Amino acid sequence: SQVQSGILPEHCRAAIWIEANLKGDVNALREASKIFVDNVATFQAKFPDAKLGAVVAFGNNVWRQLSGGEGADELKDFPVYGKGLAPSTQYDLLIHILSARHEVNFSVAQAALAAFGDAIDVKEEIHGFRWVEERDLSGFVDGTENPAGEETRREVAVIKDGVDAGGSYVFVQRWEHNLKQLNRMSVPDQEMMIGRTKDANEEIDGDERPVTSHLSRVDLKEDGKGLKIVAQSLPYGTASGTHGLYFCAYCARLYNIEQQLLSMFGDTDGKRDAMLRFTKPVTGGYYFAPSLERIQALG
Amino acid sequence: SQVQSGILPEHCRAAIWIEANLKGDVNALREASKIFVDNVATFQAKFPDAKLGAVVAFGNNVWRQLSGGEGADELKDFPVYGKGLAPSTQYDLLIHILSARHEVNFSVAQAALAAFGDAIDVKEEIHGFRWVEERDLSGFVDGTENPAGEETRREVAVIKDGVDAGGSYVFVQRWEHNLKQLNRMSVPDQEMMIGRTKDANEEIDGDERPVTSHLSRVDLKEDGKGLKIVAQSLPYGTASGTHGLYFCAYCARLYNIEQQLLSMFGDTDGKRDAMLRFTKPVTGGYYFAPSLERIQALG
Ligand code: HEM
Ligand code: HEM
Ligand SMILES: [Mg+2]
Known part of the structure; x- marks a missing residue:
């Protein structure tokens, strides 16, 4: 089983995140997802110097439908933390495109929107950029330097065994x-x-x-x-x-992410992250990124 | 007299345009402009490989006050063309930053906002990016390839003589x-x-x-x-x-630009640019970019 191309790459200079809700029949996402991952491979062949990768990932309700309730045991809607300090804006679909060339990302995003067409209603589109010295706009590093290397990143991010392997x-x-x-x-x-x-x-x-x-x-x-x-x-x-920062994290277990969020937003010992003195989250969503083989098998 | 650094550079990969109106005393723009152009030189020494350039330019009413009525004979508020086909959104101040690195541009834009501070109210900020093969998003080239070379570009864009030389x-x-x-x-x-x-x-x-x-x-x-x-x-x-396209042009005379606009929008021979079937302008402004020596003599 093969991991989607956008999960493990390091040192991307630019990214696009698109979040959308399903419109109509959930089964329309099957063919669209297949077209999109095929488009990514085509873009990679055309723009080898882009070092392009991408991910298509699904919200709980849609993935339960597409998978017949099989696997993805940890997946769930973003539940809100800190009694609202970390809000939930859960959608049905996430498209994450990253590479060394913002201009190639843009073309890929256009191809994604064309592949899904009227089956989705776009709710968010954010263009990320690596800033000077790989710092967050606060002036501190942006928090993405580690873990380094494909081997350790695969251990942390990619499901090893079972029906969800490579997700x-x-x-x-x-x-x-x-x-x-x-x-x-x-x-x-x-x-x-x-x-x-x-x-x-x-x-x-x-x-x-x-x-x-x-x-x-x-x-x-x-x-x-x-x-x-x-x-x-x-x-x-x-x-x-x-x-600000568009925070995006991949993990072989959602548990790791949730535990960090519970700690940051006052749901463990009662203390809250000191970063809330100058910044706040305004969106939040959880998604499941299947393996490429699993996407191809959608239809 | 030295031309501002953002006029002549070719083949920039990214730019930021900021349009702003004056708040309060127009004389506050004097030291602010000197601070900003000095910041630009400092950034150029920090990021030589970015090929950074920037321009500060002023709308008619502000420039007339800052120049004591000398020079800038052709300057005027941007008028409506084609009885509204081309709308007018004339502001007091234009800041144009370009380089090979969007992330450097962002830092320069932040320093610009610090330089002018409360003396301005920002009305527009657009982030431009060079697309694939230097094409407009329509798939045609983006119209910026020619004129090529510093000598010809200087002859086209830079006032040669008189009080405005270098502007x-x-x-x-x-x-x-x-x-x-x-x-x-x-x-x-x-x-x-x-x-x-x-x-x-x-x-x-x-x-x-x-x-x-x-x-x-x-x-x-x-x-x-x-x-x-x-x-x-x-x-x-x-x-x-x-x-779409953020159109930006420099010229030693405003006459050239206005003649092209009168042609495109129907005011010269009744015929209008065929491109209007798929794209439309929604902002419009004229500004004057002084020479660096002229800026330094503002205070
Ligand atoms: C405004 C948002 C955020 C900013 C500016 C930020 C910034 C940082 C910085 C400066 C570091 C240390 C640099 C380094 O990794 O060596 C870091 C590390 C880290 N951040 Fe954040 N972060 C943010 C949000 C989050 C969120 C929402 C999570 C988790 C849900 C998170 C999880 C982590 C983790 C796990 C580490 C590594 C900790 C370690 O093992 O040392 N961050 N982040
Ligand atoms: C959506 C807006 C626009 C698009 C997509 C566009 C596109 C183009 C293209 C494809 C070319 C030919 C490429 C080349 O040979 O360099 C061109 C040339 C040119 N454009 Fe535009 N343009 C736009 C707006 C404007 C405006 C508003 C002006 C002036 C007021 C303008 C002035 C010119 C000039 C002077 C040339 C060179 C013509 C020549 O000497 O052959 N353009 N543009
Ligand atoms: Mg003659």
């Missing part, structure tokens, strides 16, 4: 930064908020940083083993309007 | 494409609408192309000389939403 669970969440609130904080205070130094990205010891620091919120272990994810997040937005 | 007139106009309507047209009929062949961009002669073809509208002569411009246009937008 992955996907989480997307758009954040809106308020850089005016951020820049009122001294850099040392920002570093206690994140849990690493800002310029050199040197980790601050857990015993020396507050429990509300982002790293204390999301660096979680179970029986001494870290709950890791493969992040594909990128900055987005305009300088004079809305901007 | 340039600027015209910006955002177009919204309906690619569904274009897709209903056969490629031969698209080529008669543009005036050139689509894939090869081979000029179609005047004997065969209609006078309403775009080339027939804008390929104009005066006294044995072509009325040339230096176009910095780029595609913009989202696949599922609004997209």
